[PDB]
Design an enzyme around this catalytic site. Sequence first.
Site, PDB file in Angstrom:
ATOM      1  N   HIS A  64      -9.324 -43.053 -12.531  1.00  0.00           N
ATOM      2  CA  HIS A  64     -10.262 -44.144 -12.649  1.00  0.00           C
ATOM      3  C   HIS A  64      -9.691 -45.167 -13.596  1.00  0.00           C
ATOM      4  CE1 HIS A  64     -11.264 -41.368 -16.015  1.00  0.00           C
ATOM      5  NE2 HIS A  64     -11.633 -42.468 -16.651  1.00  0.00           N
ATOM      6  N   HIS A  66     -11.161 -48.438 -16.492  1.00  0.00           N
ATOM      7  CA  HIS A  66     -12.197 -49.142 -17.230  1.00  0.00           C
ATOM      8  C   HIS A  66     -11.698 -50.576 -17.390  1.00  0.00           C
ATOM      9  CE1 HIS A  66     -13.481 -45.129 -18.236  1.00  0.00           C
ATOM     10  NE2 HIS A  66     -12.327 -44.873 -18.821  1.00  0.00           N
ATOM     11  N   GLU A  71      -9.399 -46.827 -23.960  1.00  0.00           N
ATOM     12  CA  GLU A  71      -9.503 -45.386 -24.241  1.00  0.00           C
ATOM     13  C   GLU A  71      -8.268 -44.836 -24.973  1.00  0.00           C
ATOM     14  OE1 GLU A  71     -10.812 -43.463 -20.567  1.00  0.00           O
ATOM     15  OE2 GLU A  71     -12.827 -43.412 -21.517  1.00  0.00           O
ATOM     16  N   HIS A 110      -6.033 -43.679 -14.992  1.00  0.00           N
ATOM     17  CA  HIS A 110      -5.716 -42.470 -15.740  1.00  0.00           C
ATOM     18  C   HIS A 110      -6.551 -41.309 -15.291  1.00  0.00           C
ATOM     19  CE1 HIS A 110      -8.944 -44.621 -17.716  1.00  0.00           C
ATOM     20  NE2 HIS A 110      -9.352 -43.534 -18.331  1.00  0.00           N
TER      21      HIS A 110
HETATM   22  O1  LIG Z   1     -14.457 -42.292 -17.474  1.00  0.00           O
HETATM   23  C1  LIG Z   1     -14.218 -41.195 -17.956  1.00  0.00           C
HETATM   24  C2  LIG Z   1     -13.329 -40.961 -19.109  1.00  0.00           C
HETATM   25  O2  LIG Z   1     -12.687 -42.012 -19.627  1.00  0.00           O
HETATM   26  C3  LIG Z   1     -13.154 -39.693 -19.605  1.00  0.00           C
HETATM   27  C4  LIG Z   1     -12.613 -39.322 -20.980  1.00  0.00           C
HETATM   28  C5  LIG Z   1     -11.883 -40.212 -21.768  1.00  0.00           C
HETATM   29  C6  LIG Z   1     -11.412 -39.767 -22.998  1.00  0.00           C
HETATM   30  C7  LIG Z   1     -11.694 -38.478 -23.454  1.00  0.00           C
HETATM   31  O3  LIG Z   1     -11.233 -38.101 -24.626  1.00  0.00           O
HETATM   32  C8  LIG Z   1     -12.422 -37.563 -22.673  1.00  0.00           C
HETATM   33  C9  LIG Z   1     -12.868 -38.030 -21.447  1.00  0.00           C
HETATM   34  O4  LIG Z   1     -13.821 -38.586 -18.968  1.00  0.00           O
HETATM   35  C10 LIG Z   1     -14.671 -38.717 -17.918  1.00  0.00           C
HETATM   36  C11 LIG Z   1     -15.311 -37.633 -17.360  1.00  0.00           C
HETATM   37  C12 LIG Z   1     -16.172 -37.761 -16.263  1.00  0.00           C
HETATM   38  O5  LIG Z   1     -16.700 -36.624 -15.827  1.00  0.00           O
HETATM   39  C13 LIG Z   1     -16.440 -39.005 -15.652  1.00  0.00           C
HETATM   40  C14 LIG Z   1     -15.841 -40.178 -16.184  1.00  0.00           C
HETATM   41  O6  LIG Z   1     -16.059 -41.397 -15.662  1.00  0.00           O
HETATM   42  C15 LIG Z   1     -14.905 -40.039 -17.322  1.00  0.00           C
HETATM   43 CU   LIG Z   2     -11.323 -43.049 -18.622  1.00  0.00          CU
END
Ligand SMILES: O=c1c(O)c(-c2ccc(O)cc2)oc2cc(O)cc(O)c12
Ligand SMILES: [Cu+2]
Lengths: 344, 343
Positions: A64, A66, A71, A110
């Site tokens: 996905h 953002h 992140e 990612h």
């Molecule tokens: O968008 C998401 C995401 O960025 C991450 C994430 C980012 C950093 C972390 O440290 C832990 C998880 O997990 C996810 C888990 C889902 O089930 C659905 C999502 O849309 C995401």
């Molecule tokens: Cu993410």
Amino acid sequence: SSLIVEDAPDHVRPYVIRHYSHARAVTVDTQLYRFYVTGPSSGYAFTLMGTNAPHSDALGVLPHIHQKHYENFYCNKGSFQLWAQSGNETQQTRVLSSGDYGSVPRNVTHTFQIQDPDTEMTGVIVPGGFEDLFYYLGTNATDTTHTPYIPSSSTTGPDSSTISTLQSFDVYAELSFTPRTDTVNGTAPANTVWHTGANALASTAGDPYFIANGWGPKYLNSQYGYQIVAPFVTATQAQDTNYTLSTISMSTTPSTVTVPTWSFPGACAFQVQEGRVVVQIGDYAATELGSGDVAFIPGGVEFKYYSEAYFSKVLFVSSGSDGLDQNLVNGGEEWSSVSFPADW
Amino acid sequence: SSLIVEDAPDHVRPYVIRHYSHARAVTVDTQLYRFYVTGPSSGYAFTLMGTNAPHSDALGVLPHIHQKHYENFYCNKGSFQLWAQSGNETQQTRVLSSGDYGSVPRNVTHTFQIQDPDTEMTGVIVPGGFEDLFYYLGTNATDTTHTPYIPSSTTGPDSSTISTLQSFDVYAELSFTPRTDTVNGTAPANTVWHTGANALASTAGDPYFIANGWGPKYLNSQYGYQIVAPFVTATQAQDTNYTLSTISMSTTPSTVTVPTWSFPGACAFQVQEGRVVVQIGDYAATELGSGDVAFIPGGVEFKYYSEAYFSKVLFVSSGSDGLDQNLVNGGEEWSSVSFPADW
Ligand SMILES: O=c1c(O)c(-c2ccc(O)cc2)oc2cc(O)cc(O)c12
Ligand SMILES: [Cu+2]
Ligand SMILES: *[C@@H]1O[C@H](CO)[C@@H](O[C@@H]2O[C@H](CO)[C@@H](O[C@@H]3O[C@H](CO[C@H]4O[C@H](CO)[C@@H](O)[C@H](O[C@H]5O[C@H](CO)[C@@H](O)[C@H](O)[C@@H]5O)[C@@H]4O)[C@@H](O)[C@H](O)[C@@H]3O)[C@H](O)[C@H]2NC(C)=O)[C@H](O)[C@H]1NC(C)=O
Ligand SMILES: *[C@@H]1O[C@H](CO)[C@@H](O[C@@H]2O[C@H](CO)[C@@H](O[C@@H]3O[C@H](CO[C@H]4O[C@H](CO)[C@@H](O)[C@H](O)[C@@H]4O)[C@@H](O)[C@H](O)[C@@H]3O)[C@H](O)[C@H]2NC(C)=O)[C@H](O)[C@H]1NC(C)=O
Ligand SMILES: O=c1c(O)c(-c2ccc(O)cc2)oc2cc(O)cc(O)c12
Ligand SMILES: *[C@@H]1O[C@H](CO)[C@@H](O)[C@H](O)[C@H]1NC(C)=O
Ligand SMILES: *[C@@H]1O[C@H](CO)[C@@H](O)[C@H](O)[C@H]1NC(C)=O
Ligand SMILES: *[C@@H]1O[C@H](CO)[C@@H](O)[C@H](O)[C@H]1NC(C)=O
Ligand SMILES: *[C@@H]1O[C@H](CO)[C@@H](O)[C@H](O)[C@H]1NC(C)=O
Ligand SMILES: *[C@@H]1O[C@H](CO)[C@@H](O)[C@H](O)[C@H]1NC(C)=O
Ligand SMILES: *[C@@H]1O[C@H](CO)[C@@H](O)[C@H](O)[C@H]1NC(C)=O
Ligand SMILES: *[C@@H]1O[C@H](CO)[C@@H](O)[C@H](O)[C@H]1NC(C)=O
Ligand SMILES: [Cu+2]
């Protein structure tokens, strides 16, 4: 009104939250998320969250992007693989173990996969408020005993239909993304450096990059005892997201040095990784934090910190371009060791 | 006086020593050794030492055997490769990262190489007193600031000198060639390393390795939740007569009385994660954080509990039924690093 809280406050105030506090816990399948710093608690400056999870043979989330959140993936313990790609650039992946770092700017595709049984990811997401997504998709967890995750293969989290529906939460499906499967020694493609040599921060914003523990650039500051800043995000990479991220390692403060007071324009926070760090914020008691514990300081609030352990390392985030880590960098010198000098 | 000491005491008594305390520090080239538990401080039961060191492109020591000491390698942070071979068995190697474990029985040839910049190894050697070797080989270090270590030849004694240490129980093995076909941190192929369960060796005298979280675990529910992951049991120790494990801990619920323990042999632990309160004999309760070590003389009553919601300690005991075996025996087979979500 007390400094230590079990869930992040619903408004901006100084606070400390201990490792594995409730912290508005939710599960998503086997993963347990905790929100130590949230949008409301930081006035939207950042989120700092912890995810604990067991080994899975499947991805931890579908791939996905953002469009409005940056992140940051930090491995507190265990290990997890992270894959990322920007635009037309070669797809990159690393297996992060303890103390390793992966940067995922806006519009970088990612996904991740948990490898080790006792894995902890600390996520720092900028700006704050992204956690609504985890409230939404997650199931509330009481977790009376505060166990790190609930003891117990399709991809974890939303199915492909559901993840294509989440634009409101700033999640956009990339279902054409295929995580590369030629990992060897924790990295692909083979022409990369991971636990074998120095890692640089990306030369500009928008590109993913990874820093293995101890291998990124470091700066020694000698003004208040010794402190070594290892930058993960600077102004170069942040740009308009307007924050910094690093680790700070610390010696004790010599009895002839006064522990300095700080008050910054922007909110900041840290989570202790190793050691015992005492924080004295506002009019609250000097409080000692151990592993995984988090301290949050609103902008404009005075605070002191110092290491009671002979060596401590914390993961540090600040809103603004001139927070604590950058101040210590600017006042220090380039440095090539994870250790500080043997003499004052 | 104080429970907290800056060097291991020169006799047996309850003590705590903080992580990176002076601990009679010596350097061997780039490596810094700290002796948190010594022969004198444990009544010769065991040695517990920390070694902090930067990346090296060379071996950390020339290959060698101990005929009388059982060596235990635990990676606190960073990473190091460990090679090991018993007899004409296949030579084994693993890259240990944080929380990983390598078992080196008597008569097993071994060496190690430091990989990551911020690497710390915790050595547990049975019986105690093995540290005299490092007093000879090492140079005393003042390390006034308590820095983990001071900021390509094989590290340590050269081929001549390492052949000269038999009186410290160190026997050179200069024909040993560490294998060089490592992939994903292990060799030979088809060994299991961070990809599945690791069992303790069922044969005494064989090396073995347990990746963090992947060994057998036992859940004890008698005094809050405690999870024991054995690293050495009687099967492996035999006449060296000790146990080694990690113990992970929930808090103690307010309805449960924190138990008082006493065992005939000395025991010790080093906190790996969390915050653990220890009260030993006549001293004030003290809270330990990362890398701090508590030492309890045999026969001395003590109590411990986790102030943190989850803590993990590395634990060693002299004798065959110290704390960790007692928790196992009163516990059940368990498949998770986490304890139940309900009391
Ligand atoms: O968008 C998401 C995401 O960025 C991450 C994430 C980012 C950093 C972390 O440290 C832990 C998880 O997990 C996810 C888990 C889902 O089930 C659905 C999502 O849309 C995401
Ligand atoms: Cu993410
Ligand atoms: C994944 O990571 C692993 C590391 O974990 C990589 O493994 C390394 O792979 C390279 C390439 O295959 C090896 O380097 C080669 O080693 C050859 C064998 O070296 C031995 O034999 C020599 C001649 O008899 C001898 O000189 C040599 O000694 C030298 O190195 C010693 C270090 O062990 C040192 O003690 C000596 O003093 C001396 O300097 C060895 O005994 C050699 O012939 C080649 O020229 C080349 O250097 C590494 O050894 C491997 N490392 C390990 C620990 O296994 C692997 O390649 C990675 N995979 C990918 C795809 O990235
Ligand atoms: C070192 O450790 C590495 C992990 O860090 C190991 O890498 C794993 O290697 C195996 C075997 O080569 C891969 O599994 C194979 O994957 C391929 C490709 O799978 C993808 O594409 C297919 C087909 O379109 C799709 O169905 C899949 O879901 C994947 O998207 C499969 O075709 C094979 O059947 C098999 O599953 C792993 O994917 C790979 N993992 C990673 C994370 O890269 C590596 O083997 C280790 N090296 C050694 C020598 O031991
Ligand atoms: O015999 C030795 C030994 O066992 C070890 C060791 C074992 C466990 C540890 O955690 C750290 C070091 O190092 C050594 C270093 C030398 O230069 C010489 C030696 O003879 C040894
Ligand atoms: C991310 O991509 C979207 C969609 O193309 C674009 O509108 C937006 O400006 C991009 N944001 C950044 C910071 O690159
Ligand atoms: C990436 O490549 C595509 C060609 O498919 C092109 O349209 C696009 O503009 C390129 N991006 C940049 C930054 O130039
Ligand atoms: C909260 O979680 C429980 C299980 O933890 C689940 O059964 C419930 O539906 C969730 N939501 C509500 C409304 O309680
Ligand atoms: C960056 O953040 C700082 C600290 O919160 C704030 O004072 C400043 O206005 C921000 N700069 C921009 C351009 O938003
Ligand atoms: C170790 O090897 C020596 C020398 O061969 C032998 O005498 C001794 O019994 C062996 N010890 C053990 C415990 O196997
Ligand atoms: C090094 O410290 C030791 C204790 O291990 C002490 O006996 C000795 O005097 C010191 N060596 C020197 C040369 O000062
Ligand atoms: C094992 O050690 C314990 C405690 O130190 C001691 O009581 C006992 O004598 C030892 N047992 C053997 C078989 O030597
Ligand atoms: Cu040895």
